[PDB]
RNA sequence: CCAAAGAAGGUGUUAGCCCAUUGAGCCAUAAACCUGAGCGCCUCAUGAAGCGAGUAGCACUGUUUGGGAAUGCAGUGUCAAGUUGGCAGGUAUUUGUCUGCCAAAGUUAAAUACAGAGUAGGAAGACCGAUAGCGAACAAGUAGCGUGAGCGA
RNA sequence: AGACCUGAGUGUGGCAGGACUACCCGCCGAACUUAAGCAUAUUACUCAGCGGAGGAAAAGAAAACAACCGUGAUUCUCUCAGUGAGCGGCGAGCGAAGAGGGAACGAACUCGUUGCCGAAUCGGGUCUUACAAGGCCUUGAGUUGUGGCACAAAUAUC
């Protein structure tokens, strides 16, 4: 199959031509603004895959993300209270470079709504992640059966709760039963369940 | 929960020659360094702010609560206890008084009522009605405003027959599968007067039981 | 029913019962179980010795189900027969099964003269339980 | 077929009778057959790229003659043994094919 | 604490109280009947809609999972693809008759798969389908034998012969691993 | 004297009959909604091979959990298998079996929440009764105060 | 000359922008307090801050439990259980999961892949009482792949 040939392809990143290939779009992407779009996506058997199918209303861009770990914005690096808390430098965040990567799409640009995001590149420095987002007022999409859900206001911004795939795995949903209990529903849920203080009407 | 506490309050404390308890913060009004947030300030809570979750509904022995109307039925028997639980059971011909099953054919309310006069019980049902009054006290604004003696409560054994009776002031109908105390014993006092009908009499045996069976 | 408590019966005493001169305050002793070692330390090691320390190995996620023997005593195999079959029976002759996994029992004990004759379904058995329902006329076909 | 399980609790069979049914074709069965596409696809795409830097090294390990490097190595860069010894396994014959 | 009373472990320490301060994690039930009344009405009403199709869907029965429950029996989900093959149904169509179905479950005894067979036969027979495409259309004792087995020996022994099974093969090689 | 109506509001004093209510029913009706998927009409439809990659893991660090030689997550490094494969089976390692299940894409109603929301409605309360009850029965978040955030009768 | 790719300008059609925020969902996130002191711990994965939505939200259609005669999406209640679990200066304190009785429930589906097809697709005009799930047309998008058929509730496509 084609989609195979192309994809065992991407599965061997660290080889010498998907070593040398990924260096010059680094460079390229490193000299390029945060949000960019594109015509068509760089990894056409991933973008399917997740949802791209090449229609009107669906577009493409691509993000960089700053990488490494989160500095706390404490002012001069001074924290107060008991000692637990005085790390700087030290915390690790908890959502991924990538649930940024598609909430930078979030705000940033507003009609568009977001499916899923994919890794692209990686270096010393940035990472970037191609979102792949639709139009709730496309009508290509409205009368397509399959994506006209995305029309829904429910789904309006849909990565801002986490709720897209990169923000399904860091609220740790990836797991179902029994790895994780107390987070689901959601760990507000479940924190919910197990600390009200709950009267029976006939005690 | 937040009544009697929005406020700035604060306390100035020693050296201000004033009570140490907090005051209100600002100027101009005429409630400014008033006291605030505690049960003694005009207007602070009260003492220990009620609750939504306090115990209001008991748990009962499903036995006990058997054994009490199955008890408060044998005062219903017994012709003293109802005198004295007042009522006035004078010309009352027998004390489980008992009428016809036909008493359930009634359709119009104004026959019902000679039949009440025939049983005699429509002395009893003058009792509750000429002891009607406004009530002394606050329940009146609450929506209570009437006081109504408790009257001769009629046992019919299906729910059908309800009618003829309904408007009769002060009788109580009541299905037998379904009997309560209030009803039975109403203030915890037992020994109501009550009016058994044949087809409703009969099914006690085979509803509280007997003894060894 | 606020009318029976001793508050209601300490209107005009102003102390409430809690003293003159040491007086009510808020936390003498520190909050709750506070001060188990050092200044309870009679209370505790009185009333409750053994509540300091480890013991034993450790078990991981406990399920209950898998171990579940509720017992029961030959003594007690009565209620577990209805009237009329008790009535009947003989060592050699006829005789009501008793199921236990379907009466909520497990394991057969020790402990009485078996008071009627039975053949018993049961789980586990012990030793001298064995003996007594085998001598007695009984019998003992265990199941699963 | 499967054994019946004996009518005792304990402890070779135990466990109350019923008949015991073979299990199912599910269509999960397929996952241990080979895939004999793949296994072709895979090897184009491998001689394309030619060997991972990983793989390099490794691959010189096995000339020498140190195995049990060639093992250690992988699996501090992978952290499974039968992801390694699926690895040098894998080497072991890369060496062989070519000559 | 004063005297012999019991060491008290009521966790309360978490904010629940809703004080005039904080809001407070206290659930209550003062609308349970409510809801018992509100429960029924829409069991009525559902009813008075689904007419005359029953309320409810066939669902097999169905072993209890553990050692403590094999005794007990209750009614699972939904009944095999296996299950209604023996019936004769196929799936996809006992699901607009109101059978329900579900593609996971694995029938591994035959004596639990016959009692929802039969449990789906007598089903069949009841059931009046509605004519379809159009009105007119129509398409179509306790006995005692062996005195005395010591039956107690029986079950250590077969307890025991998986205890030990671990130890007592391992002895079994480690002397004979000897010459 | 009425009661299939006793209902509890009004009126110059305490009202079944002075009034309004209290109840079977009557007329009016954008669409939606519900009924032989309500019923006719034109067009329109219709009964061999693979299975998700900077992903899962792993190491370091930090965090969170009842989760313990690490439950989940994040950062960086490293980075799979799919030729008897992979994950889970609560003590780490190696090895053989055994049981379940097929991760890294998505949509989905009810049962569930309203802990200081809102809309149009209805029921009431062993509650407070003008220093109480919302701060607010009243032209109240008003008058008044502060540069201001705010305060507040 | 012209095309393609990449990227601009303008016209035409629309949308995001703030409000509300009790509940819900992501992140950020304390101290007072308790330990009779206090630093891990607790208070707490709470208050405060930032972002987002609904009439519910979230979850969900097994990479699930169990070790059984075996259960079968998610949620919720009782109970499990303030626990002979476990975490803890093993101190103060913390603290679940499967099973079971129930609420609900016509509850399930489509992409990618693979195999066979290969523009049958989408938009725009126009026509049929019609911005038809229609006919016609249309280098306009689209072959760097839209769409049709079958995958276990299966076991031929006209």
Not at chain 3, 6 to 13: A, D, F, I, P, Y
Not at chain 5, 105 to 115: D, F, I, T, Y
Request: hydrophobic content about 35%; charged content about 25%.
């Amino acid at each position: 199959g084609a989609f195979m040939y192309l994809n065992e392809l991407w599965k061997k990143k660290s080889s010498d031509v998907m070593r040398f290939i990924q260096r010059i779009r680094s460079w390229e992407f490193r000299h390029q603004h945060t949000v960019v779009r594109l015509r068509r996506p760089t990894r056409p058997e991933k973008a399917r895959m997740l949802g791209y199918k090449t229609k009107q209303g669906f577009c493409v861009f691509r993000v960089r993300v700053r990488r490494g770990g989160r500095k706390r914005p404490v002012h001069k690096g001074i924290t107060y209270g008991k000692p637990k808390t005085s790390g700087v430098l030290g915390m690790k965040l908890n959502k991924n470079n990538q649930a940024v990567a598609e909430q930078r799409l979030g705000k940033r640009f507003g009609n568009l709504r977001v499916l899923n995001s994919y890794w692209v590149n990686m270096d010393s420095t940035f990472k970037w992640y191609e979102v792949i987002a639709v139009d709730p007022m496309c009508k290509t999409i409205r009368r397509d059966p399959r994506i006209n859900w995305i029309v829904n206001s429910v789904h309006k911004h849909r990565e801002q709760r986490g709720l897209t795939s990169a923000g399904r795995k860091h609220r740790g949903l990836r797991h179902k039963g029994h790895k994780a209990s107390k987070l689901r529903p959601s760990y507000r849920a479940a924190w919910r369940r197990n600390n009200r203080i709950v009267f029976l009407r006939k005690r | 929960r937040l009544s009697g506490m929005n406020h700035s309050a604060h306390s100035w404390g020693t050296g201000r020659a004033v009570a140490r308890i907090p005051r209100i913060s600002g100027g101009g009004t005429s409630t400014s360094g008033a006291g605030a947030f505690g049960n003694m300030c005009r207007g602070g809570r009260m003492f220990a702010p009620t609750k939504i979750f306090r115990r209001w509904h008991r748990k009962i022995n499903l036995h006990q609560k058997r054994f009490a109307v199955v008890s408060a039925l044998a005062a219903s028997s017994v012709p003293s206890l109802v005198m004295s639980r007042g009522h006035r059971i004078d010309n009352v011909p027998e004390v489980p008084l008992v009428v016809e099953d036909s008493i359930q054919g009634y359709e119009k309310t104004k026959e019902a009522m000679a039949f009440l006069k025939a049983i005699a019980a429509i002395d009893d049902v003058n009792r509750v009605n000429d002891s009607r009054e406004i009530r002394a006290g606050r329940g009146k604004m609450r929506n209570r405003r009437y006081v109504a003696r408790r009257g001769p409560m009629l046992v019919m054994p299906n729910n059908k027959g309800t009618r003829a009776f309904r408007n009769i002031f002060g009788l109580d109908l009541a299905n037998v599968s379904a009997l309560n105390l209030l009803h039975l014993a109403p203030g915890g006092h037992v020994g109501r007067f009550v009016i058994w009908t044949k087809s409703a009499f009969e099914q006690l045996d085979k509803i509280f039981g007997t003894f060894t069976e | 029913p606020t009318r029976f408590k001793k508050c209601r019966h300490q209107r005009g005493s102003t102390f409430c019962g809690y003293g003159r001169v040491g007086k009510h305050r808020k936390h003498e002793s520190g909050r709750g179980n506070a001060g188990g070692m050092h200044h309870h330390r009679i209370n505790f090691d009185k009333y409750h010795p053994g509540y300091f320390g480890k013991l034993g190995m450790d078990h991981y996620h406990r399920k209950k189900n898998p171990m579940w023997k509720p017992t029961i005593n030959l003594n007690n195999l009565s209620r577990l027969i209805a009237a009329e079959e008790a009535a009947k029976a003989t060592k050699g002759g006829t005789l009501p099964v008793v199921d236990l996994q379907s009466s909520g029992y497990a394991k057969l004990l020790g402990n009485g003269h078996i008071q009627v004759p039975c053949i018993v379904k049961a789980r586990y058995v012990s030793k001298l339980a064995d003996k007594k329902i085998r001598k007695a006329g009984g019998a003992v076909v265990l199941q699963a | 077929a499967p054994t019946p399980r004996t009518g005792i609790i304990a402890g070779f069979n135990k466990g109350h009778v019923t008949t015991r049914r073979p299990r199912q074709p599910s269509p999960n069965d397929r996952f241990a057959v080979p895939h004999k596409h793949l296994r072709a696809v895979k090897a184009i795409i491998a001689d394309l790229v030619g060997l991972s830097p990983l793989e390099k090294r490794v691959q010189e390990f096995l000339r020498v003659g140190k195995e049990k490097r060639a093992l250690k190595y992988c699996k501090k860069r992978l952290g499974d043994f039968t992801a390694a010894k699926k690895k040098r396994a894998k080497m072991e014959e890369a060496l062989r094919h070519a000559t | 604490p004063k005297g012999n009373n019991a060491i008290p472990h009521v966790h309360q320490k978490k904010h629940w109280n809703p004080c005039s301060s904080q809001k407070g994690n206290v659930k209550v039930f003062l609308n349970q009947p409510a809801q018992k009344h509100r429960r029924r009405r829409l069991r009525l009403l559902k009813a008075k809609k689904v007419f005359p199709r029953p309320l409810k869907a066939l669902r097999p029965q169905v072993n209890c999972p553990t050692v403590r429950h094999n005794m007990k029996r209750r009614l699972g989900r939904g009944f095999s693809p296996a299950e209604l093959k023996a019936a004769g149904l196929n799936p996809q169509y006992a699901a607009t008759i109101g059978i329900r179905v579900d593609s996971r479950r694995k029938n591994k005894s035959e004596e639990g798969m016959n009692v929802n067979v039969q449990r789906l036969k007598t089903y069949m027979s009841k059931l009046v389908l509605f004519p379809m495409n159009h009105k007119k259309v129509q398409k179509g004792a306790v006995s005692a034998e062996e005195k005395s087995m010591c039956v107690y020996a029986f079950l250590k022994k077969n307890h025991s012969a998986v205890r030990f099974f671990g130890v007592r093969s391992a002895r079994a090689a480690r002397k004979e691993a000897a010459k």
